[PDB]
Write an enzyme that holds these catalytic residues in place. Structure first.
Site, PDB file in Angstrom:
ATOM      1  N   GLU A 357      -0.565   6.425  -8.161  1.00 44.52           N
ATOM      2  CA  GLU A 357      -1.515   6.115  -7.076  1.00 44.52           C
ATOM      3  C   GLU A 357      -2.828   5.764  -7.469  1.00 44.52           C
ATOM      4  OE1 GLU A 357       0.112   4.759  -4.369  1.00 44.52           O
ATOM      5  OE2 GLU A 357       1.840   5.503  -5.392  1.00 44.52           O
ATOM      6  N   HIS A 487      16.691  -5.826  -1.963  1.00 41.24           N
ATOM      7  CA  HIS A 487      15.818  -6.668  -2.441  1.00 41.24           C
ATOM      8  C   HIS A 487      16.464  -8.082  -2.111  1.00 41.24           C
ATOM      9  CE1 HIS A 487      14.574  -3.249  -4.322  1.00 41.24           C
ATOM     10  NE2 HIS A 487      13.434  -3.683  -4.619  1.00 41.24           N
TER      11      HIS A 487
END
Ligand SMILES: *[C@@H]1O[C@H](CO)[C@@H](O)[C@H](O)[C@H]1NC(C)=O
Ligand SMILES: *[C@@H]1O[C@H](CO)[C@@H](O)[C@H](O)[C@H]1NC(C)=O
Ligand SMILES: *[C@@H]1O[C@H](CO)[C@@H](O)[C@H](O)[C@H]1NC(C)=O
Ligand SMILES: *[C@@H]1O[C@H](CO)[C@@H](O)[C@H](O)[C@H]1NC(C)=O
Ligand SMILES: *[C@@H]1O[C@H](CO)[C@@H](O)[C@H](O)[C@H]1NC(C)=O
Ligand SMILES: *[C@@H]1O[C@H](CO)[C@@H](O)[C@H](O)[C@H]1NC(C)=O
Ligand SMILES: [Zn+2]
Lengths: 596, 98
Positions: A357, A487
């Site tokens: 991150e 997806h």
């Protein structure tokens, strides 16, 4: 007085207004994610509606300037982004039915549940129970039942909807300048107007084909080894020449093989490197985890964090009355606001996630100077690639010993390195053939090469020929297997992961060569190497202003994606696999099937 | 001798300026959560400003070769646009008193 001069001022005005509107949308989203309430839901909805209306208005305005009259190669990119025509070019009713199909598919996937036949005692959803069963259970019958039950529950419902979806998306692409929706998605890599650095939509197909052809030997040896171990596990259900069955791969789809690590670990006596107990015994917490990650990113040469970042970011879960999503995410709210939303715990996995991150946030800081339309990654893969390269660099035993988590008196052997490389192989190499196969099938379906009466037949034949995976129970045209994946159900681009897998290894090779590393590539730490940080920053600062080919040139010295970094990374494990499988038939035959 | 939007369109110091420029942060006082749109800056002017000049005329900028005819919209934009100052902003966009 000219097209270019007129376009410049409009782009400046749009960038300035979009900065503020995107900031209020992002702040509303952050508030809702941190603190879920009806007021926050209303605020987020209002901000999103305002942002969408602004985008539509400016997109309709921007169509006035022809792209043949712009010769800056940056205003051209901004105008292309504005004129991408996100607002539907089709009819109102057609847009409404497209949204209806998308919403129905998303709802079916999210709310899909499976119960026992004529028995409402137990009803398991996908994530809580079905994924847990697929990940942990060793029962062949239970795994087959769960796999077939999910497929029968979702694909039968989602098949005609997906057929209407492919027809509608092909119509939308033809209404725009693209050929099919596969062409639309491949256009993300298309670079035109820059001689010597151009990338074409058709070049992506050939590049991916050549890269997979290069990867094939390593994947074949990995498949042989995993097949041998699974033959040791299940005695007669796996043929020494047959393809690996789908439901035994570890997850519901076979995207990742990481769940097979426990069953197929090479050497179990020596445990893998764990630092949770050490962190507890040294009294570490999330705040100092992020502080150590900040120190690492300073040492590599990237800038320090912001006081506003430290004050506003919530790195620990408030708990109690407060409820918030715990999926780690790095937020670039804009105008200097960078935040991380992560329910960090004291684990090595959370340490690596924090590094990932903070890599995201460092990229976001790097491209902050560029305009709003260019404040992104050069393509869909570099952003997560930059996250992952830091993740791998910060997990080395050398770095752990330097930071002090491990005892410095320790020394490493062959088994530990082989085990770590095999785990990373099951994580990384395994998802490449699956991603390639899924993207190829989706592109062919969009192009209309695969007829409706042969969709699933061609799908399974190509899976058997490429990934070496065969269905347990044969499925006729009624089922729609690919629609099970999130997806595919929600219509997200999926070649991003293949591209990221290649890009992260190319970045790692380049940065390790910069950092004057001697030895195998897996044991590479770029902690105190200042040159590697600048070499990466040369791309990080660009953003989308330059083509991804030029960015890749700046980082690695090559204009095209290369898989030799992956091959060099997995060379020791490849040697181990050659040693192990010397007596095993490497490869698979299409004739064998579980059903007889 | 600085080139930039504010320098050429809002307040231009002379090349041989003799004076002191004093700046200190005002985020603690002049930032509002809702967005302080009172403060504005100019981002479209016909030419560069002469040194030590104040231009307060706000009419529809004529970017297009067609007459704006006093209205805005296509190729005709408002000369002024405001900062939105909020306390959560990071350094580099916080309001500074000079
Ligand atoms: C237009 O070209 C000039 C080259 O003189 C460049 O400095 C400028 O940044 C370009 N426009 C944009 C929006 O980048
Ligand atoms: C976007 O849609 C509008 C609808 O009128 C059309 O005029 C324009 O050519 C489209 N642009 C592109 C790039 O497809
Ligand atoms: C800025 O970086 C330095 C080291 O380069 C570090 O000591 C300092 O704490 C950083 N500032 C903030 C606000 O984190
Ligand atoms: C969420 O925000 C509201 C309004 O700002 C506040 O009253 C509340 O205490 C916050 N937390 C929770 C758990 O509702
Ligand atoms: C190197 O790894 C092999 C694995 O086959 C092992 O047999 C050998 O003992 C290792 N070498 C040393 C010095 O431990
Ligand atoms: C990297 O630099 C830090 C700070 O001087 C130092 O403590 C650490 O030992 C260095 N790394 C290695 C591998 O020596
Ligand atoms: Zn990432």
């Amino acid at each position: 007085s000219t097209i270019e001069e007129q376009a410049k001022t409009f782009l400046d005005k749009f960038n300035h207004e979009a900065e503020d509107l995107f900031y209020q949308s992002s702040l509303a989203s952050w508030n809702y994610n941190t603190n879920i309430t009806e007021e926050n839901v209303q605020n987020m909805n209002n901000a999103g509606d305002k942002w969408s209306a602004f985008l539509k208005e400016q997109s309709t305005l921007a169509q006035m300037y022809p792209l043949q009259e712009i010769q800056n190669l940056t205003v051209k990119l901004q105008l292309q982004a504005l004129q991408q025509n996100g607002s539907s070019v089709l009819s109102e009713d057609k847009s409404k039915r497209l949204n209806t199909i998308l919403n129905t598919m998303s709802t079916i996937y999210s709310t899909g549940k499976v119960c026992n036949p004529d028995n409402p005692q137990e009803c398991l959803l996908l994530e809580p129970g079905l994924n847990e069963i697929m990940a942990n259970s060793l029962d062949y019958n239970e795994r087959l039942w769960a796999w077939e039950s999910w497929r029968s529950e979702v694909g039968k419902q989602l098949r005609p909807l997906y057929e209407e979806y492919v027809v509608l998306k092909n119509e939308m692409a033809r209404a725009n300048h693209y050929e099919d929706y596969g062409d639309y998605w491949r256009g993300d890599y298309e670079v035109n107007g820059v001689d010597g650095y151009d990338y074409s939509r058709g070049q992506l197909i050939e590049d991916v084909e050549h890269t997979f052809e290069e990867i094939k030997p390593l994947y074949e040896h990995l498949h042989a080894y995993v097949r041998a171990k699974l033959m040791n596990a299940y005695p007669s259900y796996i043929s020494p020449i047959g393809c690996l069955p789908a439901h035994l791969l570890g997850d519901m789809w076979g995207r990742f093989w990481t769940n097979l690590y426990s069953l197929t670990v090479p050497f179990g006596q020596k445990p893998n490197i764990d630092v949770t107990d050490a962190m507890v015994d040294q009294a570490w917490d999330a705040q100092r985890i992020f502080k150590e990650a900040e120190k690492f990113f300073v040492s590599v040469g990237l800038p320090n964090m912001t006081q506003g970042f430290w004050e506003n970011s919530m790195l620990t879960d408030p708990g109690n009355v407060q409820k918030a999503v715990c999926h780690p995410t790095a937020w670039d709210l804009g105008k200097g606001d960078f935040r991380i939303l992560m329910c960090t715990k004291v684990t090595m996995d959370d340490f690596l996630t924090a590094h990932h991150e903070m890599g995201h946030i460092q990229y976001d800081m790097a491209y902050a100077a560029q305009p709003f339309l260019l404040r992104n990654g050069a393509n869909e893969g570099f952003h997560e690639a930059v996250g992952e390269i830091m993740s791998l660099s910060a997990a080395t035993p050398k770095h752990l010993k330097s930071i002090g988590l491990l005892s410095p008196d320790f020394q490493e052997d062959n088994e530990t390195e082989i085990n770590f490389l095999l785990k990373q192989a099951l994580t990384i190499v395994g998802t490449l053939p699956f991603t390639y196969m899924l993207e190829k099938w989706r592109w062919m379906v969009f192009k209309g090469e695969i007829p409706k009466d042969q969709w699933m037949k061609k799908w399974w034949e190509m899976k058997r020929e490429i990934v070496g995976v065969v269905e347990p129970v044969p499925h006729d045209e009624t089922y729609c297997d690919p629609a099970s994946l999130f997806h595919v159900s929600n219509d997200y681009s999926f070649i991003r992961y293949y591209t990221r897998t290649l890009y992260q290894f190319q970045f790692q090779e380049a940065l390790c060569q910069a950092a004057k590393h001697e030895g195998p590539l897996h044991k590479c730490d770029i902690s105190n190497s200042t040159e590697a940080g600048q070499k990466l920053f040369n791309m990080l600062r660009l953003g989308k202003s330059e083509p991804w080919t030029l960015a890749l040139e700046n980082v690695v010295g090559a204009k095209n994606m290369n898989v030799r970094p992956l091959l060099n990374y997995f060379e020791p494990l490849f040697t181990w696999l050659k040693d192990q499988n010397k007596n095993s038939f490497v490869g698979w035959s299409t004739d064998w099937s579980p059903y007889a | 001798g600085q080139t930039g939007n504010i320098a050429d369109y809002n307040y231009k110091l002379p090349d041989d300026f003799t004076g002191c420029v004093i700046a200190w942060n005002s985020n603690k006082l002049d930032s509002k959560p809702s967005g302080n749109y009172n403060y504005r800056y100019r981002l479209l002017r016909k030419s560069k400003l002469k040194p030590f000049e104040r231009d307060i005329s706000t009419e529809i900028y004529q970017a297009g070769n067609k007459p704006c005819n006093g209205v805005a919209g296509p190729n005709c934009y408002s000369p002024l646009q405001s900062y939105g100052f909020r306390p959560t902003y990071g350094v580099g966009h916080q309001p500074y008193r000079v």
